[PDB]
Structure formats: C-alpha cells, structure tokens
Scaffold this motif. Sequence first.
Motif, mmCIF file in Angstrom:
data_model
loop_
_atom_site.group_PDB
_atom_site.id
_atom_site.type_symbol
_atom_site.label_atom_id
_atom_site.label_comp_id
_atom_site.label_asym_id
_atom_site.label_seq_id
_atom_site.Cartn_x
_atom_site.Cartn_y
_atom_site.Cartn_z
ATOM 1 N N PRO B 1 0.824 -1.206 0.000
ATOM 2 C CA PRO B 1 0.000 0.000 0.000
ATOM 3 C C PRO B 1 0.862 1.262 0.000
ATOM 4 N N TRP B 2 1.430 1.647 1.153
ATOM 5 C CA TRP B 2 2.446 2.696 1.217
ATOM 6 C C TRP B 2 3.774 2.124 1.671
ATOM 7 N N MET B 4 6.829 1.932 3.801
ATOM 8 C CA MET B 4 7.137 2.383 5.144
ATOM 9 C C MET B 4 8.647 2.571 5.283
ATOM 10 N N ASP B 88 2.029 21.299 -6.479
ATOM 11 C CA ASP B 88 0.857 20.442 -6.117
ATOM 12 C C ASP B 88 -0.011 20.248 -7.316
ATOM 13 N N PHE B 91 1.886 18.400 -10.128
ATOM 14 C CA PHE B 91 2.081 16.948 -9.846
ATOM 15 C C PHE B 91 0.813 16.106 -10.035
ATOM 16 N N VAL B 92 -0.298 16.668 -9.570
ATOM 17 C CA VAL B 92 -1.630 16.097 -9.776
ATOM 18 C C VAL B 92 -1.938 15.853 -11.265
ATOM 19 N N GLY B 94 0.277 15.592 -15.115
ATOM 20 C CA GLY B 94 1.333 14.624 -15.433
ATOM 21 C C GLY B 94 2.691 14.737 -14.724
ATOM 22 N N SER B 143 5.883 18.985 5.847
ATOM 23 C CA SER B 143 6.028 18.108 4.686
ATOM 24 C C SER B 143 4.685 17.742 3.999
ATOM 25 N N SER B 144 3.603 17.991 4.714
ATOM 26 C CA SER B 144 2.256 18.135 4.201
ATOM 27 C C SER B 144 1.986 19.169 3.096
ATOM 28 N N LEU B 147 3.735 16.611 -0.177
ATOM 29 C CA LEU B 147 3.482 15.148 -0.126
ATOM 30 C C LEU B 147 4.068 14.461 -1.324
ATOM 31 N N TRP B 148 3.958 15.145 -2.474
ATOM 32 C CA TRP B 148 4.507 14.682 -3.758
ATOM 33 C C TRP B 148 5.988 14.280 -3.743
ATOM 34 N N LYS B 150 7.559 12.474 -1.683
ATOM 35 C CA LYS B 150 7.758 11.109 -1.194
ATOM 36 C C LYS B 150 8.052 10.196 -2.386
ATOM 37 N N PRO B 151 7.170 10.169 -3.412
ATOM 38 C CA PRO B 151 7.532 9.323 -4.558
ATOM 39 C C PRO B 151 8.619 9.900 -5.454
ATOM 40 N N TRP B 157 12.766 13.239 0.949
ATOM 41 C CA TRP B 157 11.554 13.217 1.723
ATOM 42 C C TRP B 157 11.869 12.843 3.187
#
Lengths: 223, 219
Positions: B1-2, B4, B88, B91-92, B94, B143-144, B147-148, B150-151, B157
Amino acid sequence: GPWAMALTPMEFARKYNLLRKDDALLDNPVPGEEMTAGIRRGDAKRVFTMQLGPYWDGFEECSPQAYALSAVFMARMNRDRDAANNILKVLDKTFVDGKPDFSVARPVMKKYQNSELVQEVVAKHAYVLTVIASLLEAAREDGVVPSSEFLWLKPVDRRLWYMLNCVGRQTPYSEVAGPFAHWKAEKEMGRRSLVPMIDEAIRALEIAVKEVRLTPRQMEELE
Amino acid sequence: PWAMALTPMEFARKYNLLRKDDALLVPGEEMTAGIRRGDAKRVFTMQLGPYWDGFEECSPQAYALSAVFMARMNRDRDAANNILKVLDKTFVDGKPDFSVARPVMKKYQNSELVQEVVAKHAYVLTVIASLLEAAREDGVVPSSEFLWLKPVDRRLWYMLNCVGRQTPYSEVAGPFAHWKAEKEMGRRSLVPMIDEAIRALEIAVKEVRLTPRQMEELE
C-alpha cells in the motif's frame, strides 16, 4: 506503478484489446479519416461497466479511504472546516509514517451522514463513486477543496483518486470514464440508476481513438 | 500500500550489517546481534549524497524546495506558496513544473540568510535541512505542503521530514548525524561525521531479540 500517468485513450484501448478494423471505413472510405482504427463496443461496455465499482449501501460498507474522504466532504457540505481539516492533517501525518487510520473520520461520519444535504446526494446516486463525486462537488460550495489535499490517495486507490480528480473537469481519464459518464447520466436523469449508463464513455473513446493515425504495420495488425 | 520507513533491524538486515557477537561478552542481551561498524560507516557515508556545489547543480526537486525555503527565510510567503501551489497542482497532472522555482532561486540565492546557511553546510542534504529549519522561523512549513516529494525523491523526503525530530529514520541517519555534527562544529565539514548514526544503530539493534532461526545466520 502506483504512480504512473493516467493511460491516454489509445493506451487504454490497447491495454483492454478494444481496437478493431473499422469496416464502415474499410468498405466506404471517408476522406479525412484514413489510417484510424475502430472500437469494439461490446468489449468497451464491459470495461466501462467494470470501472463503476460497488453500489452505494451505507457509508459503513465503503472503503476506508472513501469513508474518510466522504466524511471530509460531508463536513465541508455542513460548513465545518475544522472537522474537515483535522481529518486531512491526521491522514497527512500518518501518510508520512507507515499507514493511516481512516478511523479518525468516524466521529464526523456519525455527525453528518443523516444531514439534509448528504441525504439529498445519497438519494440521487447509486454507486459509491457517483455518491462521492457529488459529495466533492457539493463540498466545493463551501470553498476550495483540491485533490492536492489528499495526494496520498493515488497509491491507496487509483480509481478513487482519478474519479475525484476529474470532478470539475469536462473530460475524464479513460480509467474513470465509466463512473464519470454514469455520474453525469444520473445527474441528467434526476435520479439514481442501478442500470449502468456508460454509453457516453464509449462514444468519447471512439472519437478519441479516431483522432490518432496508425502506421501501416499497425493497420494490418488490427483484427 | 504505502512504502514504510525501515525499522533499525530491517535497515540492518537489508544492508547485511548484523554480525554474531561473541561468547566472550551480557545478561539480558541473549539472542541479540552486533553491528559491523565498518560496513555501517560505508552505508551511512553513501547516504550523505552529493556535496553542495551551486544551486544550479541540485536535482530539480531539491532546487525547487530550496527555492521555497529561501522565500520563507526572506518572508515572501506568496512566492513560496505559489511554488508549492504550482507543484501540487502540477504533480496532480502529469509532471510538476520545477522550473517555476527558477525565478525564486534567482531572487534569494544570494541573500544574507541563505549565504549564511550555504557557508556552514557541505552537503546538499545538510544545506536544504538547514534551509527548511530556517524557513520555519517565518511560519509553519510541514512536509504536508509537499506530499509529492515522497515518490519523487525518497531520501530527500525522509531528510526533510526529520527536521524538527530528535531521532531520524535509519535511511537518512548518515546525513542527519552529519547535519547535527556541522551545526555542533560551527562549520561545514567535507569529511563525513556519521559516528552518531553508527552508535544509534547499535543501540537499536541490541534492543531487538532475534529468533533461533535468525541467530543461526549470524557471523
């Protein structure tokens, strides 16, 4: 792979074996339409129908993520931003960490699910996807609610993320084109429909596929 | 899922850092492993990443978040929020538009407070850690709002989510310890100062009992 781009229409059609020789053109060629495939309508009906997902049958039966996002949009519909934001922040923090509890939303669900505005939405839509789409659209009466704020959703639930990202778009991603077409049909009919109403997804896919020239190798490759 | 963050013991297994700790050593320490100090040193050294060598030399992600944080250090919330809003939104769709940071990088890269940070940190990771910590003198920057990342860049991150925290994730313990070390020496250091990360990994691995299965594997 949790984070790929949305498939383009042509890529969607190839992923689901939806391209065919277009024998209306192959027996009656139309100038300004050469080197284009057709769509297998029957198979596309199946594919769009399987994107629709489960029928709405109480918020307690929803996915954890659908549950918790519905609660936010509920809270916003009912003009309670701190309930909304609080859920947003906890899911944000626990997204940084390993896994989130969506259970943070339960108190807000309990408080707003039987509210007048939520009951109007649920009355008028039959699928989880189409309920929550309409819940998002009503929450944006309150103000700004971008899909930004639940970026974490894309790896959890690709379908739900795309459905919610297309709310407010005029053209949806092919991967949510079924529920989007159905959502619109429900809205146009003025009632919920359990019968899949996904024909607009098929017409749009046909059109989008017609705008893309194939190579000769690709034309011969069609069956 | 995510995906960790690794625990200390999983970090240690993943890098083959556990070792049989001898029958000439502790009560309450039955069924525990020791650490290969040299190999851990090399893993933590490798986590430090590249030297800072001009902002034009950073990754697109590091460049743009650095631009955000500088903007906040210089109290231009708007240009910082614009960048973040823009990445934001973008990223949402492409791919996010890191180029939007370019103008901001040009306006504040040579400003007093940024120059003070760059002077005192030798690594990209330690620079931007300090840019973030200083960006928080202006206001909240969680970091909220990115969020983008992270990947896009897992390491970065994890480094940036550790600013404010007292114990880092093991996957950035190297550059976290180095950063603290540089703040403690009062200068940049090109020589890796990652011993705190080794000492913390040892402590943490010693708190975890292994199974007979896992003890049999140790050397």
